[PDB]
Every structure is written in structure tokens, then in C-alpha cells.
Amino acid sequence: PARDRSYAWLLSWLTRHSTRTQHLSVETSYLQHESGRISTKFEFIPSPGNHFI
């Protein structure tokens, strides 16, 4: 389930293992520290649906 922390770990492992996943979903990490230094990074996870690995 989503509540368990293994959800994100498994999604990251899937996107690291199956590099050629045509269908994907995005996860943007956005944090504005003090002095207004904006840090952004795009993390991709398998999109909702059925995937075969």
C-alpha cells in the first residue's frame, strides 16, 4: 500500500532497473531554502497501470 514506505522504495527500484519504461510519471522535488536558492530535480516513476519487468 501507499502508506507503507516500501512503495516509494519499490518505485525507485523499478525505475532504476527497467530504464526503458515508456510510460512514466513525474515527481518534482522543490525546496526554496533561505536566501531564495531554489533546488529542483525530476524523479520519474512508473505510471499507473500494468507494467511487465
Partner 1 sequence: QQEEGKTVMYTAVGSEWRTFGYPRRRRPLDSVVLQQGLADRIVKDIREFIDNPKWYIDRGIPYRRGYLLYGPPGCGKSSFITALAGELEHSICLLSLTDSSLSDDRLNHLLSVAPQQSLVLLEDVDAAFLSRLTFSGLLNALDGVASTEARIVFMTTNYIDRLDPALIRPGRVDLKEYVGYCSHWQLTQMFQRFYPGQAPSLAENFAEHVLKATSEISPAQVQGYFMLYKNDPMGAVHNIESL
User: Which positions lie near partner 1, rule CB under 8 A?
Assistant: 33-38
Nearer to partner 1, 35 or 50 (CB): 35
Whole-angstrom Cα distance, residue 53 to residue 18? 7
Quote the least distance from Cβ 13 to partner 1, whole Å: 11
User: Smallest gap, in angstroms, from Cβ of residue 12 to partner 1?
Assistant: 9
Read off the DSSP letter of residue 21: -
The set of residues, in sequence order, having a beta carbon less than 8 Å from that of 28 and lying 6+ positions away, is 40, 41, 42, 43
Output 5 or 22, the one with its CB closest to partner 1.
Answer: 5
